[PDB]
From a paper:
Following this contact with the tpilus, the movement of tDNA into the periplasm is driven by its interaction with the widely conserved periplasmic protein ComEA.
Because there is no interpretable electron density corresponding to the ComEAGs linker region (amino acids 125–142) of either protomer, it is unknown which of the OD monomers in the asymmetric unit OD dimer connects to the single modeled DNA-binding domain. ComEA oligomerization interface amino acids are conserved and mediate conspicuous intermolecular interactions between the OD domains of ComEA protomers, e.g., the side chains of ComEAGs Arg85 and Asp113 (corresponding to ComEABs Arg83 and Asp111) which form intermolecular salt bridges. As predicted from sequence analysis and noted previously, the ComEA DNA-binding domain structure contains two helix-hairpin-helix (HhH) motifs. At an intermediate concentration of 31.3 μM we observed both monomer and dimer, and were able to fit the sedimentation velocity data to a discrete monomer-dimer equilibrium model, resulting in a Kd of 33.8 μM (95% confidence intervals: 19.3 μM, 48.4 μM).
Numbering used by the authors:
A (entry chain B): 62 to 124, 143 to 207
B (entry chain A): 62 to 124
Write the structure that this text describes.
């Protein structure tokens, strides 16, 4: 009636814990100390039951799926919503002319990326 | 009672190790110096039971 689970990912104390088979993913994460500041509880089923030998992975915002605007290529840049050849090549032109981007809001200074455009792009970015 | 396993992949010291049959993959990988900075931790279950002649391959990120 006991389960051994590998609680890893964006949890405070990742390890191999021992809990009751009637426990649920939330309990195992609670025992592990909660979520780190980079976790994404969106993609975790906190209600799912625990079984022995189970692996509980908590991914981080991204996941991987983040394009580093400062060090991306035209092919990688235009992989995001809206950004195409000319919009991707202006973000790269601004990269090389007026320097790299400090924050996500620096994209607003690029021609073609307005407030509407930036909103459908924020969660897929990685601005050093 | 005894289980011999081959720990390969993104571990500090891959190779053959001996473990108790009642052990988990956590123990086998602890004997090899644990994972490395390039191990795809999402591809390794340390709560898994170990059996004799078992091969434990830890893939890298990007494989």
């Amino acid at each position: 009636k006991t389960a051994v689970v590998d609680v890893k990912g964006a949890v405070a104390n990742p390890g191999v814990y021992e809990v009751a088979a009637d426990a649920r993913v939330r309990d195992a994460i609670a025992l592990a100390g909660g979520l780190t500041d980079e976790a994404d509880e969106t993609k975790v089923n906190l209600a799912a039951k625990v079984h022995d030998e189970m692996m509980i992975y908590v991914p981080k915002k991204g996941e991987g799926m983040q394009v580093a605007i400062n060090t991306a290529t035209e092919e990688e840049l235009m992989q995001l919503p809206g950004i195409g050849p000319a919009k991707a090549n202006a973000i790269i032109a601004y990269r090389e002319e007026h320097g790299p981007f400090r924050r996500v809001e620096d994209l607003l200074n690029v021609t073609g990326i307005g407030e509407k455009t930036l909103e459908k792009l924020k969660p897929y970015l990685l601005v050093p």
